[PDB]
Design a protein around this nucleic acid. Structure first.
Ligand SMILES: [Mg+2]
Ligand SMILES: [Mg+2]
Ligand SMILES: [Mg+2]
Ligand SMILES: [Mg+2]
Ligand SMILES: [Mg+2]
Ligand SMILES: [Mg+2]
Ligand SMILES: [Mg+2]
Ligand SMILES: [Mg+2]
Ligand SMILES: [Mg+2]
Ligand SMILES: [Mg+2]
Ligand SMILES: [Mg+2]
Ligand SMILES: [Mg+2]
Ligand SMILES: [Mg+2]
Ligand SMILES: [Mg+2]
Lengths: 124, 109, 225, 19, 216, 51, 128
RNA sequence: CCACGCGUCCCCCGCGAGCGCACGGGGUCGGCGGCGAUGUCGGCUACCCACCCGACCCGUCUUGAAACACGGACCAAGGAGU
RNA sequence: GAGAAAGAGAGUGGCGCGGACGCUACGCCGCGACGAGUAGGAGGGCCGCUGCGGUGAGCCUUGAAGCCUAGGGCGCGGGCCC
C-alpha cells in the first residue's frame, strides 16, 4: 500500500543519505528533499514534484496520475511554466488547491518554485 | 580639569579560605571604612585601567595604549566598608593591590 | 444555514461566562465571611481572658490544633526510626516545612524527631504567606504552582474547598477535610534562614533551634521565606 | 446560584435582570 | 456620541480606586442607564474595465520563515514610557556634568525634556557650554538653586530640535536661542553673589575629600 | 506558567482573592483617616500647650 | 554581505576547553583524547579539588544551538554537485562543506552552483 | 454595601453595544552614541608567558597508598573472556 | 483549560478563488520530580578498526591512503569535518 512501503523505504532506501546529524532523501519528486512520510514521492498515489526545466529558465511541475500506479512511464505528467514569478506560483497554487491534489504539499511546492526562480534570475 | 573618580584598591577576589571565586572583585574604597558609609557607592561604575604594548582604540580620540576593564559595584562586603564588584571580564591577579578608579557617574543624588 | 447554530454557541459561551462570574461572587463573599470569622476568633480569646482576670481566675486557652514542622538537619547519618517518621511527615529535603495537626498520635511522632525538626504554632499571617509564596499542590502527583483557583477547585471541589482562602481556612481553622487539604499541599521548600540559625544541634530551650518553639516559629518563618 | 446544575434558572434569571 | 467624562473615582494607590463598585454604581448611575437589545477596485482601461486587486499576493517566498511570537502586555515602546525625575533636580538647580566633554562644569538646569533628558545651560558666556541635553543619571545635582519661575524658554526647542543630524558647523538659530535664553538666565545668577565665579570653575576631587562625607 | 508572587504582585492576589482589593481599600482609607486624626489631636495638644 | 541565516541566537557554550585525559601531559605515549580512568586511588576519578575535570552530561549544549557553526549555520559535507540540490530548501539553516578529496576542477562547479542556489559554503576558496 | 427592574401565587415578620487603561498566561523600545584601509576591529578555543586560588604519581593488592609496598627510563608496533 | 459523569447531535408534530510551520509516529511536542558512586549489571553510540553482500550515475593523477601543523571548527565525550 503506502504505509507498508514507507516502513520498508524509511531506513533502507538508496535515496536516503545520513551524515552530520541530518537525514535527507534524494528521490526526484521530493519537496523539501527531506526523509519524511508526507514528502516522499515514490510512495503515494498522488504526488507533486517541482523541478527546474530542461531549458535554463522555466519550472516543470510533475503530477502523478491515479491510474497507472504500476506503470512508471505513463504515471507522471509534466507541465512547463516559463512565466513571471507571480503567475507561476499562482498556477502551482491553483493546481494543488483547486484540483484537491494532495493539499499538504501546497505550500512546500510554492517555496520550492520560489527557490528555483530565484536561482534562475541572474546572479548578483 | 581635575580628578573625577574615587580611589579604590583591588584587595582580592571573593574568596573562601580554600576557594576563590574570580567572578567578583573585592574593592577597598579609600575613605569609607564602614557599612554606614558604603551606602553611597552601591551601583557605581568602576574601572581597572592599565597600559599595554599594542595600541587599542580609544573612544573619542586617537588610538592610545591605555586599556580598561569596566565593571560595577554590586554590594557591600563586611563591616569595614569593603565592597563587592563585578567586572564584565574577570580581573587578572596582576591587579592585586592596585588602583581601580571607582567612578561617580551612575549617580543617585 | 449557520444561523441558530451560530447563536447557540455564544449562548453557551455567555452561559458559562455568567457561571464563572457567579463563582467569583461566591468566593468573594466567602472570603468576606472568613475575615469576619477571623476577627471573632482573635477577639474572643481576648474577651475571655479579660473576663477571667476581672473575677481573678485564670483562662487557659485551648491547646492549638495546628503546628508547622521544618526539617533543620540534613540527610546524612539518620537513625531509621527517626527516618521513617520524617518520611511520614514528608520532610525529605533539608528545610522543608509541613502543616501538621496535633493529637496524641502526632505529638509522640514529633518527639521522636525533635532533634531534627523545628516546629511551633503558626500565626494566621504565617499560614497566609506560606500558601501564597511557597504553596504548591500535588496535582496528578505532579507539582503545579497554585496560580489560579481552578487548580485548587478541580482537586478539592468535593470537599467544598474551591478558592485559595478556602484552603487557608481549612489549614488554619483545622477543619474536617484537613488530611485531604494538607496532603494536597506539596511540602514547602523553604529557603535557608536569613539572619541565621542560633545552633542547629541543640534544642530551643537550651539555646538552639531544634524542638518545640511555640509562638516563636513565626520569627523563623518570616525569614525562611 | 454558583453551582451549574441547580443554579441554572437563577443565573438565567439574573442574566435577564442585568438588562 | 457624548462628551467623555474623566475618571469618577480618584486614584487612591496605583490600581486601587477610592470607591468600591457599589458606590461606583451609584456614582456612574447605572441604576437608570439600563440598556437592552474593499479588496477589489474597478477601473476603466483603454477590452473593457479591469477589476484590479489592491494588496496582491507576494511574488516570492523565502524557503523558511520564523513563527509568530507570543503576546506580552506591559512592554511599551520608549516614547510611551513614564519619565522620572530625582527629588533633588528642580528647574533652577545647578548641576555637575560628570561624563561628557563638559567634564565637571557647574551648570544651570532648565527643563525636563520629553525624551527623559535634561535641558542644560550653564551660560556659555562664562563656562562655555551651550543649550545641551544631558541625562539625569550622569549628573550630580548640588543644592544651589536660582529662581527661574519668571523666565520663558522657547517652545520650539525640544528633543527633535537637539537631535543629531547625520564638520558640524552651528546654525544661527542655535545662536539666537542661546542669546535669548541666557539674557534671562545670566542676570539671575549675577544677582546671587559669587555665583558667576562659581559657575566658571570645575568640580574636582582633591586629596583627602570623599563624596560620601561631603554634602552638596 | 511563571509563578508571580501574590504578596508583591497586586492583580495576581486579586486573581486568587478579589476580596483582598476591598480589604486593602478599607485599610488604606483607615490608615489615612487615623493618621489625620492623630495629626489633628497633636495640633490640638500644641494649641493647648500654647494656651 | 554573505548568506546570513534565518535566526542567529546567542550560542552560549558551557565549556570551551577540551577534556584533557588525565596525565597526558606527563607522558608522550598518552594522547590527550579523554578516557575515564578506572583506578582505585585516582584523584581524578573520585573528583578531588583542583584536578582535571571529567566530562559529565551537564556540559552538553542546548538543542537549539547544538552543532551550530559560529556563523549560525550547520555544516553538511557535500561530495559532488548533485548533493547541493538537497540543500535547495534547507537554506537559511544548513550550509555546505566540500570534502577534502574533491578535485580543484570539481570545486568550481560546486561553488558556482551554490552561488546560484544561495547556499553558504564554508570553504569556497579552498584551491584558488 | 460584589444591593437595583416589573408583573404573578404563598410562608413569616440565558446572545446590550462600542472603545480604552492595565501590578493581568516569562522583554521590549514604534530609544540612542562612538569608531573604523595599512593601522586598526573580532577570534571564547589552539602557541608562549605572567599572576591569584587550588594542586602528592599512576596502575595495583588492601580495612586503609603520595607512601620508607611492589611494576614503570623513553618511544613505535604486536598484546589477553576466543 | 473546563471546579461538577455525560451531544458545539440529527428529525416530526402547536464581489475578491485566500489561509505560516508541522508528522524521519523509532517523529515532534508538553508538564513534574530527579542526577554521588568501587566490585558488578544493563542501555545507547550519526564513537573508532578490518573485511563481505547491497547502494551513493560516490570520490581520485586538475593528486587517494598515510604523515605534519602557532590555521578555522563541531560534539558532554569517544571522535570527526574543513
Ligand atoms: Mg554527621
Ligand atoms: Mg547578609
Ligand atoms: Mg595508589
Ligand atoms: Mg579507595
Ligand atoms: Mg596554594
Ligand atoms: Mg600488588
Ligand atoms: Mg592477595
Ligand atoms: Mg596490609
Ligand atoms: Mg576492598
Ligand atoms: Mg611510610
Ligand atoms: Mg621493599
Ligand atoms: Mg607483589
Ligand atoms: Mg622499578
Ligand atoms: Mg551516577
Amino acid at each position: 500500500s503506502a504505509h507498508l512501503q514507507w516502513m520498508v523505504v524509511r531506513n533502507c532506501s538508496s535515496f536516503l543519505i545520513k551524515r552530520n546529524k541530518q537525514t535527507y532523501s534524494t528521490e526526484p519528486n521530493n519537496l523539501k528533499a527531506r526523509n519524511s512520510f508526507r514528502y516522499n514521492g515514490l510512495i503515494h498515489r498522488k504526488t507533486v514534484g517541482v523541478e527546474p526545466a530542461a531549458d535554463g529558465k522555466g519550472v516543470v511541475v510533475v503530477m502523478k496520475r491515479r491510474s497507472g500506479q504500476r506503470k512508471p512511464a505513463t504515471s507522471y505528467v509534466r507541465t512547463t511554466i516559463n512565466k513571471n514569478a507571480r503567475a507561476t506560483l499562482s498556477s502551482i497554487r491553483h493546481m494543488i488547491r483547486k484540483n484537491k491534489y494532495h493539499p499538504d504539499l501546497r505550500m512546500a511546492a510554492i517555496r520550492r518554485a520560489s527557490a528555483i526562480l530565484r536561482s534562475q534570475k541572474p546572479v548578483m | 580639569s581635575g580628578r573625577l573618580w574615587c580611589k579604590a584598591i583591588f584587595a582580592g577576589y571573593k574568596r573562601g579560605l580554600r576557594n576563590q571565586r574570580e567572578h567578583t572583585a573585592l574593592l577597598k574604597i579609600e575613605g569609607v571604612y564602614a557599612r554606614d558609609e558604603t551606602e553611597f557607592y552601591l551601583g557605581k561604575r568602576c574601572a581597572y585601567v592599565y597600559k599595554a604594548k599594542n595600541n587599542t582604540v580609544t573612544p573619542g580620540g586617537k588610538p592610545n595604549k591605555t586599556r580598561v576593564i569596566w565593571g560595577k559595584v554590586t554590594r557591600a562586603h563586611g563591616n569595614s566598608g569593603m565592597v563587592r564588584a563585578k567586572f564584565r571580564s574577570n580581573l587578572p591577579a596582576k591587579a592585586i593591590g592596585h588602583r581601580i578608579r571607582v567612578m561617580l557617574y551612575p549617580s543617585r543624588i | 444555514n449557520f444561523a441558530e447554530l451560530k447563536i447557540k454557541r455564544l449562548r453557551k459561551k455567555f452561559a458559562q461566562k455568567m457561571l464563572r462570574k457567579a463563582r467569583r461572587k461566591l468566593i468573594y463573599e466567602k472570603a468576606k465571611h472568613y475575615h469576619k470569622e477571623y476577627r471573632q476568633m482573635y477577639r474572643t480569646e481576648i474577651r475571655m481572658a479579660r473576663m477571667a482576670r476581672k473575677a481573678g481566675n485564670f483562662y487557659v486557652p485551648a491547646e492549638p490544633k495546628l503546628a508547622f514542622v521544618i526539617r533543620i538537619r540534613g540527610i546524612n547519618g539518620v537513625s531509621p526510626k527517626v527516618r521513617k517518621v520524617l518520611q511520614l511527615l514528608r520532610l525529605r529535603q533539608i528545610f522543608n516545612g509541613t502543616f501538621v495537626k496535633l493529637n496524641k498520635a502526632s505529638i509522640n511522632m514529633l518527639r521522636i524527631v525533635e532533634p531534627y525538626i523545628a516546629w511551633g504554632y503558626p500565626n494566621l499571617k504565617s499560614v497566609n504567606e506560606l500558601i501564597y509564596k511557597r504553596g504548591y499542590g500535588k496535582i496528578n502527583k505532579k507539582r503545579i504552582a497554585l496560580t489560579d483557583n481552578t487548580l485548587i477547585a478541580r482537586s478539592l471541589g468535593k470537599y467544598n474547598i474551591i478558592c485559595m482562602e478556602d484552603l487557608i481556612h481549612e489549614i488554619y481553622t483545622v477543619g474536617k477535610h484537613f488530611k485531604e487539604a494538607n496532603n494536597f499541599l506539596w511540602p514547602f521548600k523553604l529557603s535557608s534562614p536569613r539572619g541565621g540559625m542560633k545552633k542547629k544541634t541543640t534544642h530551643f530551650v537550651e539555646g538552639g533551634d531544634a524542638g518545640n518553639r511555640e509562638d516563636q516559629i513565626n520569627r523563623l518563618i518570616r525569614r525562611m521565606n | 446560584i454558583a453551582h451549574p446544575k441547580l443554579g441554572r434558572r437563577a443565573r438565567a434569571r439574573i442574566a435577564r435582570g442585568l438588562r | 456620541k457624548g462628551k467623555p467624562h474623566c475618571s469618577r473615582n480618584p486614584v487612591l494607590v496605583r490600581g486601587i480606586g477610592r470607591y468600591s463598585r457599589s458606590a461606583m454604581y451609584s456614582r456612574k448611575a447605572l441604576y437608570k442607564r439600563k440598556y437592552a437589545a474593499l479588496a477589489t477596485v474597478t477601473k476603466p482601461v483603454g477590452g473593457g474595465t479591469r477589476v484590479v486587486k489592491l494588496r496582491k499576493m507576494p511574488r516570492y517566498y523565502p524557503t523558511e520563515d520564523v513563527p509568530r511570537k507570543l503576546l506580552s502586555h506591559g512592554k511599551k515602546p520608549f516614547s510611551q514610557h513614564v519619565r522620572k525625575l530625582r527629588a533633588s533636580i528642580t528647574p533652577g538647580t545647578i548641576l555637575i556634568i560628570l561624563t561628557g566633554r563638559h567634564r565637571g562644569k557647574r551648570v544651570v538646569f532648565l527643563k525636563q525634556l520629553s525624551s527623559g533628558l535634561l535641558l542644560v545651560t550653564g551660560p556659555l558666556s562664562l563656562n562655555r557650554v551651550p543649550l545641551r541635553r544631558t541625562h539625569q543619571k550622569f549628573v550630580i545635582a548640588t543644592s544651589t538653586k536660582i529662581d527661574i519661575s519668571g523666565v520663558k524658554i522657547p517652545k520650539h526647542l525640544t528633543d527633535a530640535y537637539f537631535k543629531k543630524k547625520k564638520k558640524y558647523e552651528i546654525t544661527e538659530q542655535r545662536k539666537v536661542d542661546q542669546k535669548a535664553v541666557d539674557s534671562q538666565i545670566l542676570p539671575k545668577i549675577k544677582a546671587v553673589p559669587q555665583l558667576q565665579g562659581y559657575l566658571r570653575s570645575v568640580f574636582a576631587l582633591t586629596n583627602g575629600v570623599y563624596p560620601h562625607k561631603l554634602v552638596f | 506558567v511563571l509563578k508571580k508572587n501574590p504578596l508583591k504582585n497586586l492583580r495576581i492576589m486579586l486573581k486568587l482573592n478579589p476580596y483582598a482589593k476591598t480589604m486593602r481599600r478599607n485599610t488604606i482609607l483607615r490608615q489615612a483617616r487615623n493618621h489625620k486624626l492623630r495629626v489633628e489631636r497633636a495640633a490640638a495638644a500644641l494649641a493647648a500647650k500654647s494656651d | 554581505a554573505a548568506l546570513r541565516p534565518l535566526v542567529k541566537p546567542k550560542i552560549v557554550k558551557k565549556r570551551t576547553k577540551k577534556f584533557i585525559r588525565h596525565q597526558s601531559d606527563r607522558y608522550v605515549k598518552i594522547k590527550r583524547n579523554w578516557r575515564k580512568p578506572r583506578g582505585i586511588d585516582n584523584r581524578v576519578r573520585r573528583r578531588f579539588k583542583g584536578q582535571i575535570l571529567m566530562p559529565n552530561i551537564g556540559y552538553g549544549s542546548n538543542k537549539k544551538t547544538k552543532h551550530m557553526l559560529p556563523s549560525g549555520f550547520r555544516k553538511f559535507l557535500v561530495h559532488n554537485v548533485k548533493e547541493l540540490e538537497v540543500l535547495l530548501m534547507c537554506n537559511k539553516s544548513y550550509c555546505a562543506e566540500i570534502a577534502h578529496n574533491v578535485s580543484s576542477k570539481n570545486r568550481k562547479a560546486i561553488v558556482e552552483r551554490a552561488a546560484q542556489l544561495a547556499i553558504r559554503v564554508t570553504n569556497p576558496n579552498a584551491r584558488l
